[PDB]
Amino acid sequence: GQKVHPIGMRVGIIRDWDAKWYAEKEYAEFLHEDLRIRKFIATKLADAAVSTIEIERAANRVNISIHTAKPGMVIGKGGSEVENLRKELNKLTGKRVHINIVEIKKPDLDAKLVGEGIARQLENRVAFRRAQKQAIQRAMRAGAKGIKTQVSGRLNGADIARSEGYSEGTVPLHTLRADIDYAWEEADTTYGKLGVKVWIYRGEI
RNA sequence: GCGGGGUGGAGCAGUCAGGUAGCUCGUCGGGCUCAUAACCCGAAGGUCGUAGGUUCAAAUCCUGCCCCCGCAACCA
RNA sequence: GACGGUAUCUAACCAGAAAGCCACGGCUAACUACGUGCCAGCAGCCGCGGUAAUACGUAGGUGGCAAGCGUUGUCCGGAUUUAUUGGGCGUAAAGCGAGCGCAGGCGGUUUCUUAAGUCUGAUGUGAAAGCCCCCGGCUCAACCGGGGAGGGUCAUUGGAAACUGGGAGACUUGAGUGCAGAAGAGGAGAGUGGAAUUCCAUGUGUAGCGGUGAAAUGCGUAGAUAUAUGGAGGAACACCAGUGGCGAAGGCGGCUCUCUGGUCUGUAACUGACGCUGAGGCUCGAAAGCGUGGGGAGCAAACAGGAUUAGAUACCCUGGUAGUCCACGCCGUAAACGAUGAGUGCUAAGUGUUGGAGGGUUUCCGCCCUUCAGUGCUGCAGCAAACGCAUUAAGCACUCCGCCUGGGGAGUACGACCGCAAGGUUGAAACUCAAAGGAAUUGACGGGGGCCCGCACAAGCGGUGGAGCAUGUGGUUUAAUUCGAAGCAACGCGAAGAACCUUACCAGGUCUUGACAUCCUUUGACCACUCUAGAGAUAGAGCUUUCCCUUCGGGGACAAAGUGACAGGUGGUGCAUGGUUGUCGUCAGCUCGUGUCGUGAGAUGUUGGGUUAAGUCCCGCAACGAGCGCAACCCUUAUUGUUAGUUGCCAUCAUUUAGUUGGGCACUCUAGCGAGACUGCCGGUGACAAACCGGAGGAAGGUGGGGAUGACGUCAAAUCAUCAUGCCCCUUAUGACCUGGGCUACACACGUGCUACAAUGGGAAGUACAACGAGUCGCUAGACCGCGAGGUCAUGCAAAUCUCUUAAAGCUUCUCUCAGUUCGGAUUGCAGGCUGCAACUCGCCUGCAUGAAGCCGGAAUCGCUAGUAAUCGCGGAUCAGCACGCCGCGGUGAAUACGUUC
RNA sequence: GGAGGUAUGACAA
């Protein structure tokens, strides 16, 4: 059957909100500025392994923390690239933006990056079994307590869609204390959308 | 000309022996079934071919007339 | 010298004139694009084609072969698929139903002999050409020539002599005879016994009997059935009785006698291979059937009647003829079965039993051992596709016979033989299919079995189906009644808000780089507002008309224009998809790694014994572990310590109409941090286990109550209108703007609701008790106006402070008095109130008037196991306004569960 | 434990 979102289930139990601000009358305004901020960054930094955006609001300011496995690319030479990002965000948001780059250690354990990686390979006509197996290898070598991956759609151009997935170790989706990262990424192929889902189980909380 | 028949959609009673219009299957509506059949429950469908008489009252008795069916309509 | 100026040779000249055919899904060497969309076509077989075809057609490539390449036809091969080499017959095709036997095939030991078979030597011959072998010739090869070899079940002749055969002997083990015993439903004939059924007669006796799931037909007051005593007649033989016995098989069951077959065991006197098998022939051969003559109790095709049923030419019931029985003569077939031909020998064991034999003990009885022949069970080796067989082989061998060669057409046709007939025996082909089949495996299923669970049923309570109305759906209607959902799992569903908007539909009016983007662009503002026209969109006017900066060259931020790329689709396909969801179901399962078993698919684990809500745990186990689920971690609710004490609270105090003010946070409460339940404690049961039963303490006890949490998968289930997206389609349009209409249309059918049908009530008055929640142009106190909906001035509160919000059921009095009513409140008239630019189509509310059906609801059907159902209100999301819906909240608060057949 | 005997359901997918 259908399963609860692994992150939505643990938000407020062991996982915290990414939108780390409070508001009453500007809640609607702030929320949809965040969506424009998140959408803009996902376009500007599509080439950098940007995983988590945390937004904090202090009066007229907007503090934005960007987690990236390629901090050097995001920053650029002498902060050229991030500085061009604050100006673009300042124009977009209409207020002061501070951008904080955070280094993602162990990107092989970050579901979004792993899912994005598998998605890119499928777009290169890489064997879908191969793409998932080597993602599993990297995650386990990085020390994951377990990893689970799945690809759905018209695999290798098959007329009839099907889902093929692989797992290793433990992925206890019902254990609420388990720190299970999840991501869904889409790979657009010649035949249409392929859905890549990744579950990574790190040290339980 | 000799008989037989006209009553609900069809097939039949009731007609002799006057009082109250039904039975069989079917039709329609609802149930039951995944569905159909079977089954269950409700409803509808004729003032008795048609028009006069007799009577307190007729589908019934009397009379006519129109329809439908089997016979006959000529023998050495 | 016909060939003939032919071969051949030499010189010059030019790459110049000289390649195709088939195949490329697998077999099978060779792959991609278009085109086509179960069409056109391909195809040797399997099979391709249903709008993204390496299989159809074309092209480019590629493969094979090449002056050829392919197709068709024919033969051999592959084909062990007629098996001599070289197969089979328990269940796949295949053992004749069984015996007796002529011919034939085969046949024990041995001496001598022969030598037909067999083996061997020599000679003769097996023409030439041809294949093959050497050797030469043509420039090579083909081709030609020379020399050989090979080829015969050949003849003549000389040898050998084991084996088969012939001849003369000998032998005793096979086979038979004798002698001595053993058992038997073996057969035939003639008698005979009891039990029971039926009929008949006679008493007794009185209204039923009989029968089925339930009934009826039937029998009986003309005396039944039952009961007693008898008589008649037919058929079959209870107990004994037993994978017990006998027989070739079919078969044979009371007892007695007469005639008669066979088998088994000892003995070892006799014969001396006399044997085995056996086409063709002959004999026997269940049951049904046939003929002639008897018999006829019971049973029972047919048949009759009664039922069942949609129909029943059935199953069921009541009857009942042939037949079943006897004699004689036919028939000659059966899942005539061990679905396993006969004879012989050989190849572990264990244990029953029938008939014998021998010995060792036992007083006998019997026990012990050895053995023969049957009959069973279990089980090695071996065999087998497996199932299984296994000294009673399906094992290892030899002999003879029968039979088989894909399924269907066929055991049919024709012919023949046999038969009284019914039919039997023998037995094809055309044509057709690419399968039929055996065993085993995993699932699913069963009107199979066992064990369990769930408001599944049962036990209850209240409903739905009837009425009115609300709402969704079908249908119909319509210019449109937008699209989606359809068994559970569509139908108060997407819609948590259709008057306009929404809106996707329709009519009319309109626009064509566009309502919305990006990119180029240009002598920069654009909007905005104003007026006319217009339903409006829109036009035609007036009027204003932009910033950032750097050095002054400009650029960049934004329009707005221009123009071409492009935009735009709630257009299609949820059978191309991602995501999301329902569903089985919070049911307990679903698997993997390694090992092991199996030829194999698979199996094991995961089953078994317990236990649990649970694949929960324990124990056992050819398994040992692991993962996804279960459980736990999370939320809420029930008790409590501590910290905190306002806006919450008021016990001890004084005060106020007031928890008011002072004062205090003690209690309540709010909220963080903690405490508490863990089978932890105790008794019993249990396999020293898991666990179960009860107990104490405790606010809470065994998951405390509830929630969140939904395994691998299932239904090509839902969604291309949330979004996204492959492919397809539209592009002055299927895009876009506007006003109006529609989505709310109504002869009808269904789903879900609401309100009722009254007195456990209606009406009036008085009085009490919640919780979850919401609030800024919002929630609104208080006062005043209005019958009311509400209006007016005005107040507090961005809020455990103010407000919505004095909850309704409830309780206490009064009234009504069973009435379609003082029940019910549909429908309609009139008059108003709000929100809105506007409520005619289409809003909600109010007053007055009006006062419909409905008297508790057919078949059928739904929810619920307690703070639940039932009933009562309250808040919220969407929302200007608008729900009887949805989500949540508290009040009051039951009935029942024996039990698991359905 | 094992063994011989006593109503209906298009076609493709």
Ligand SMILES: [K+]
């Ligand atoms: K082909």
Ligand SMILES: [K+]
């Ligand atoms: K052979």
Ligand SMILES: [K+]
């Ligand atoms: K036989």
Ligand SMILES: [K+]
């Ligand atoms: K010889």
Ligand SMILES: [K+]
């Ligand atoms: K005898």
Ligand SMILES: [K+]
């Ligand atoms: K006879």
Ligand SMILES: [K+]
């Ligand atoms: K024996």
Ligand SMILES: [K+]
């Ligand atoms: K054939």
Ligand SMILES: [K+]
């Ligand atoms: K409906």
Ligand SMILES: [K+]
């Ligand atoms: K889907």
Ligand SMILES: [K+]
């Ligand atoms: K295994």
Ligand SMILES: [K+]
């Ligand atoms: K506390």
Ligand SMILES: [K+]
């Ligand atoms: K699409």
Ligand SMILES: [K+]
């Ligand atoms: K879409």
Ligand SMILES: [K+]
């Ligand atoms: K309703």
Ligand SMILES: [K+]
């Ligand atoms: K209703």
